[PDB]
Amino acid sequence: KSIEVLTGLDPVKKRPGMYTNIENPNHLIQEIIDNSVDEVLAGFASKINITLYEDNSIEVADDGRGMPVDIHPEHKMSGIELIMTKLHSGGKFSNGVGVSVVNALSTRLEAEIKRDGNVYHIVFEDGFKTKDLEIIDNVGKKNTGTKIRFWPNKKYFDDIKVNFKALKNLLEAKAILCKALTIKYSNEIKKEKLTWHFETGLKGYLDHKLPAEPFIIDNFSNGDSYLDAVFCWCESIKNSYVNLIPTPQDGTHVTGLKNGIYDAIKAYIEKNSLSVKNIKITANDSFAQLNYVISVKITNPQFAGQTKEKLSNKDVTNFVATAVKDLLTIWLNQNPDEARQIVENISKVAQKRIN
Template sequence: MATSKRSEYGESSIKVLKGLEPVKQRPGMYTLTDNPLHIIQEVIDNSSDEVLAGGASRIEVTLHKDGSVTVTDDGRGIPVGIHKEEGVPAVQLVFTQLHAGGKFEKDSGGAYSFAGGLHGVGVSVTNALSTRLEVTVWREGKEHRIVFADGDVIEPLTSQKSPRPKSATGTRVHVWPDPKYFDSPNIPVEQLTRLLRSKAVLMPGCEVVFINEKNDSTQTWKFEGGLREYLLSEMTAEPMIPPFESSGYATDESMGFAVGEGASWVVAWQEEGVPVRESYVNLIPTPAGGTHESGLREGLYLAMKAFIEAHGLMQKSVKLLTEDVFARASAILSAKVLDPQFQGQTKERLNNRDALRLVSNFVRTQFEFWLNGHVEEGKKLAELVIKQAQARQNSAKKVTKRKGSSVAVLPGKLTDCESEDISKNELFLVEGDSAGGSAKKGRDKDFQAILPLRGKVLNTWEVDRDRIFANNEIHDISVAIGVDPHGPEDDPDLSELRYGKICIMADADVDGSHIQVLLLTLFFRHFPALIRKGHVFVARPPLFRMDVPKTGRKPARTIYCLDERELAVERKKLEKDKVNMDKVTVSRFKGLGEMSEQQLWETTLNPETRRLMPVTFGELSLSESREMFDMLMGRSEAAMRRAWMENNGDQVEVDI
């Protein structure tokens, strides 16, 4: 008898990826694979962290003719002694273990209080994706050398007397990226040059040198003017008023932040040209922005709004928004965060919720002081900002005029938003009246509308289009969004659409998931164009809240976790930071209605800190998606559903 595929699943089927194998198997999970620049940046970031910690004042990067790169700094040198627990040299651990490094220790005795390479997978990824990597360390009067190939040690650590003076410490890393892991083997010189120049800007007094052997050129940067000098050199138009440059850092824990956390920034407004915007966290570029950038925008907006109101400059018909203040602004922001949480290992976006409040508080205070000391410049800026708001409002009105003249009577339980800008407006379909009440209080009434849903929504998979309005909940949803039901082949009129984002917001438990499925069934079956055009989203509220006590330099804080898996990850991080887990309180939200309006805003409504998942058709074709919905939602498919659950039940995380 032939052996079934199921019986072949045994102990030998379980593969354990050890050491750097996970990186080689899935490099895209650990770094950008367009070209090798990011793995070189990991090495540069380590040298930058040495500058940040006060251990280095010079970084030299050499691009060799064969495409390899050498990064040298005059820092303290990577430790080379034998690690007590692992029994191998520390420098070997740094380059061969994904979670090894000197940046996990966050108290005042840590080697790096503020560092960018906090995942502990940086240079080990560089090593894994390189055909060869040589490390030379000058430390304690000796020169130490170790060599790797494809992530493995091929020349163990050797030590000899250093030809340099004992005080001349440092690290040199020579990397040969493996071209098979990248779309292009060539390092983009322009991007590398820009990165090195920005490092020099963010580290005043540090000399950064770039030697390009391919064209025999050398460039050296050492900025004394800091952020201001850099921004003005990058801007394509003259600023209309003097740039606003300042900084703010926590000096004690009274503000709820660790000592040293804060930011420095420079902002310049221009009437024409393309604005220049760059942000960094602990010297790491964050091209996708994040919560620190949101804090800068919010601080500028709050201070500008207060100035305009204090001087009676606002016109009655104008509603000022954050984007109006920042639209014509060029800005460089450099934030220091003790424990930054980035979106993915590529570190392109900062996710820390507290960073928004951290930067906003300092920016608002400093900008209010600046405006009061530069009243005429402030009034000139206010004029630009108000014009920007008027232009935005006029643009929104033009969209409204294109709509039909007939107006449906909106549902009485709908709490609508004030804005008429469809691209900005959001409708939250909220499970339950109690959660709806918290959402109404916690929302931003300018652009967020709330429609509470009572009870389970009807399963509409097998309900005809002309009969779905018999259900009050579905009737209210359709009227609120302004779009009539339609089929997958139809091209419906979306000119009456009232919200750019329609967000399903249900509890993070099994019942909430059921309501999500019923609503997704409704949109897929009767409003597919909204999914196709990218208007449907699922809000992801947290299931757990962790209250963490003060630890070392880190003040008491609250961490929200989406599910059990994220809770486990956060627990491991806290244990690594030597937090007393007996004093950590973990509570589980029974539902959205249990959250306060502030908690609901921070975790689920605030565009800067929430988790909002777009709904798309995914990899399945339209016909395959229909078959799946037939099996899952069809009344006559119970037998097929049961078979499917028996085959796939082991993939489900049970929530009891």
């Protein structure tokens, strides 16, 4: 918030490849999903509905509070227009892109917002408003939501066809990580509907893709920070997420799982026996054969460099570590035969490193 930056859309139209992946419009669809996901994470949306039409438009709808429409004092336009028609960025010092990138790279965009008993409607073309915000209908006060339909512009894309298969993979991936979410998908070209809703979240996922029944951390929290995790050892899946988006280069949340596991194995070796007390085991050793998914839900996810691929928040590391240690120790201290096996294989990895 120290520096706030506001431009028009020309830099996006001039270098589309710096604001999206231009093979197809999927990344644009991702921008819209991400916003609707932020409304799920804030506790207000439970439903994300996606439609692919035969005219090659894409519609995404949620049942959240609805994108605000109040007039900005300084900019003299509604929230929906302000967010759609200008590039928003900023930070702490100089030297995610926003839905305006989708508006910019689209010949047409329509927004329907339900709030405060009103159905609002607005239309853009090539990133400029062309039909004013207007109340077109009325509705129950608790009938709320945001719905965006957009028409990707062929001049900015190698192909206007949506890659359906990757879109489906992505939606499933997200529904897995948020049990309070139900995602629906309708492809009117292929005549195909899907519904993803995972009541037990990640349960069973590792099994499908020691302990024999993998360990699950189920919605652990400290204030406005949430942790879901599943892991086991094996002879491979190693996925981590922040706010439902992959962190292919790990970070503080992973280091958190790593340290929390080490601490748990080290303490258990110390408090038991197993002829392993004299083996110099490392965090790396107890992590070596670990298969897991960890998914954290935090307030202001800070990342590495200028990209969003490695979580940096220096206090997530001990948020995860402490939780993993406590939960895993409890489990170790009620599963004797398997603890012993986990410990032994870990010692084996350590001895092979030392030799």
